[PDB]
Structure formats: structure tokens, C-alpha cells
Amino acid sequence: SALEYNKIIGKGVNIGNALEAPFEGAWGVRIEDEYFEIIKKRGFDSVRIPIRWSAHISEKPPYDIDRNFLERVKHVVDRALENNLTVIINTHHFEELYQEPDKYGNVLVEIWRQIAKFFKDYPENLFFEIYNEPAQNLTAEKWNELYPKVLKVIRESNPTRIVIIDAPNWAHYSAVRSLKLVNDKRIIVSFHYYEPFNFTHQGAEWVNPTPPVGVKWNGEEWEINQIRSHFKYVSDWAKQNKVPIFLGEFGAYSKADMDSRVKWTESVRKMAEEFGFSYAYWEFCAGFGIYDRWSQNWIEPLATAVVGE
């Protein structure tokens, strides 16, 4: 039945550079109501909404999320659900957790206690995702310890809602094997795919050091074969552990030449489809965007590379 839920993720897109910034709009995107209609009409099944809850909580236990922030996330979720999209909400960019997980693990626990309580009565097509891209000091070991704790508390108020568990090491495809799965029939494991990194993140200012621009991805056979090896590796593991897979982010930065981006994106997307993985493109309208807010239209053929059909 987890597999049937994964199928309602289907074809997805992240709304990035929005609520996972230190505040909404700081990174260039404010989520407009009309985007959900636009995304649904284009052919997507789902949206994934990164959210930096840790920027809108009290310092003192039990770390109350600010009420106006919760109402803003409720509005966004509501608009997406009213467009009959599956919705995934996460916690994202919890900077202290990356550095000091032992110290901040219980804050993540309490954030999730509140969100889970707030959304408990929501329809089944709202999924929760405990944390985006565990990495740094939140090691595979420490993540295997923390995530079941958060899940326990989500389950107290939401006994059956799908919960997405990311692989550690920035949700690298390889990191799937280092995940210790709990016995829960309502989880989906997620990886993010940006290989080759030198191509998808060429010119990216936020990476140190910035890989140089001008890197090509040609869609040759050995290149395609590379994607298949990575995805077969995840599939093999997922089949053995009886767990659905969500490719929760993939995309190539717009400093890459468009032709390469199109071929890479189409290839990655077709590979996720080949192995039965749901997916969410990174991302809707910012630096990796498939939608142009100024021209008010999809960027083609990259959008088609994502959506297919």
C-alpha cells in the first residue's frame, strides 16, 4: 500500500527558493496561489514544499512555531490540495542541526510534534518528510538514531500518514544502503540525484569551491549507462527492503547550457520512471526553474523533459 501512495507522488516539482529561505521571498520566490493551478494544468501530480520551520520557532522548549508562520504554510498547503495535487511538506535548512545534531535533535522532534498535530486531520495526500538532506555532523549513524524518534512522535497523532525518510549524506543515491529502516508500512525512502555534480552544479555560487562553467552532458550511451547504474543500485536495495523510492530532487543549474540540461533531465526522469521511482524536479521557477514568471510560461523543452507524456 506504501507503493500505491508513492504512485500518487507520480510526477512532481519542488517549489524552491521560497519557504526554506530564512524568510519567504529572501531567495527570490514567494509562493503565489496561481502557481498550483499552473502546475496541475501542466500535468504534475504533486508538489514538494521545502520549509525552514527552524527559522520561525521559539528558543525556549517546547519551541512553539510562530502562529502566523503556521497559517502561511496552511494557506500554501490548502491551495495545493484544492488543486488536487499531492503535497509533501518537510523541514529544510535547519542549520544548527547540521552542526550540532545531538544538541538540536529534540528541537526537530518538537517541530514535528507541532506540525503533525496541526495537520493531523488533513487528507491522506498530504505527506510529511522529516528532514531534507541529512549531512555534515548529522551522520548516517546519528540520522538512523534521530529519524525513528521523530517518526514515533508523528505517529502518535498521525498513525498512518506517509512519511518520507531521506538517505543521509545529502540524500546521495549511494547513501541508501547506509539507512537503517524501521518497521513501518507507511514510509517512503528518498534520494536526490545531481550526478555528475560538476555538470549539474557548474557555476553554483553556494558550493565551495564553485565548479567551472562550460561543462557538457551529451546523452551518450556510457553517460546514460552511468545514471542507470546509480538508479539500479537504489532499485536493487529498495526491492530487497520492500520500500518505495521517491527521487525527491534532481535538476541542472541554468548556468549549464540548455541543450545539455534538457538531455540530462529527460534521461534522469526516464530512468526514475523505468525503475518505478516517483520524482520531484528541482525546481519550479528559480535558478533551476522550468517556469518563467516574467514571460508567464513554461521553459520548453525543459518542462517537457520533466513531465514527459
Ligand code: NI
Ligand atoms: Ni518569521
Ligand code: NI
Ligand atoms: Ni488562506
